[PDB]
């Protein structure tokens, strides 16, 4: 048996056993990325900040995403819409 056919991707897609389109994988490997972004962005801890508004750059200046400012007045974790890093105010 081959375990690379029924394995789901990060987009929630899998060919079921009654599908005709699994005949393309009888001679070739189905490429599924094992590095999902959801677990790899849930693995990092949130960043604690004291000021009301913060900025997220995503890394280096010219090599990161465009600069955004996040307001941390609401309690909870605020997620940057570009990189996915979470900020929190104490």
């Amino acid at each position: 048996c081959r375990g690379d056919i029924e394995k789901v991707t990060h987009t929630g897609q899998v060919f079921d056993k009654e599908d005709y389109r699994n005949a393309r994988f009888v001679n070739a490997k189905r490429y599924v990325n094992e590095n999902w972004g959801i677990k790899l962005i849930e693995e990092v801890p949130p960043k604690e900040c004291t000021e009301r508004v913060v900025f997220c750059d995503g890394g280096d200046g010219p090599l990161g995403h465009p600069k955004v400012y996040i307001n941390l007045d609401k309690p909870g974790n605020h997620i940057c819409g570009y990189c996915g890093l979470r900020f929190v105010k104490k």
């Binding site: 490429y31 972004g37 962005i41």
Partner: protein, 186 residues
């Protein structure tokens, strides 16, 4: 020094403008070059001198020729250092792709992100022009250093999102080095 048939102006240079010489020394010189193959002897000597030159054969694939950090090769999708995929499904690359190879279909993910459900690049349609990496606001899509990706089968060049993500995982060091050494030019 032969005379000029046409008077050469200041801003121009004339070829085959020399008069044919009629003094007996030049006629005997041209006659001996015709009869005894003197100019053919000079051509043979110039040809034979290139046997002793260094060969320029670069012995592929043990030794590979020069490239550049700006080089356009296999398209690839990068990732953040934290691990989240960089491509925010903003679709400027498909709008700017002149052969329209890129197909993007996007849905909201479970945590609320914008990231794609489908990112396909037809590499049989892609012309390797690099407009997508210039039109990418984040550094998501990129021209990798790889060009040894010839395929046996036509369908294997239809690159999926998982193939581009695997190319980004495989080629991350050289792509990051090229982007570090090239971002201030762009």
């Amino acid at each position: 020094e032969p005379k000029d048939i046409v008077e050469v102006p200041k801003g121009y240079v004339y070829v085959n403008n020399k008069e044919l010489s009629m003094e007996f020394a030049d006629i005997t010189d041209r006659a001996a070059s015709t009869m005894f193959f003197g100019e053919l002897l000079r051509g043979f000597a110039v040809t034979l001198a290139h046997i002793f030159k260094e060969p320029a054969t670069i012995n592929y694939p043990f030794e590979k020729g020069p490239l550049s950090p700006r080089f356009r090769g296999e398209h690839a999708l990068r990732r953040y250092p934290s691990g989240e995929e960089r491509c925010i499904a903003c679709k400027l690359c498909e709008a700017i792709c002149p052969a329209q190879a890129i197909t993007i279909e996007a849905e909201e993910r479970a945590d609320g992100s914008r990231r794609t459900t489908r990112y396909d690049i037809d590499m049989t349609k892609c012309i390797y022009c690099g407009f997508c990496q210039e039109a990418c606001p984040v550094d998501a899509i990129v021209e990798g250093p790889n060009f040894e990706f010839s395929t046996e089968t036509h369908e294997e060049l239809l690159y999926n999102k998982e193939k581009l993500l695997c190319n980004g995982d495989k080629w991350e060091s050289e792509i990051a080095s090229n982007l570090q050494a090239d971002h201030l030019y762009r």
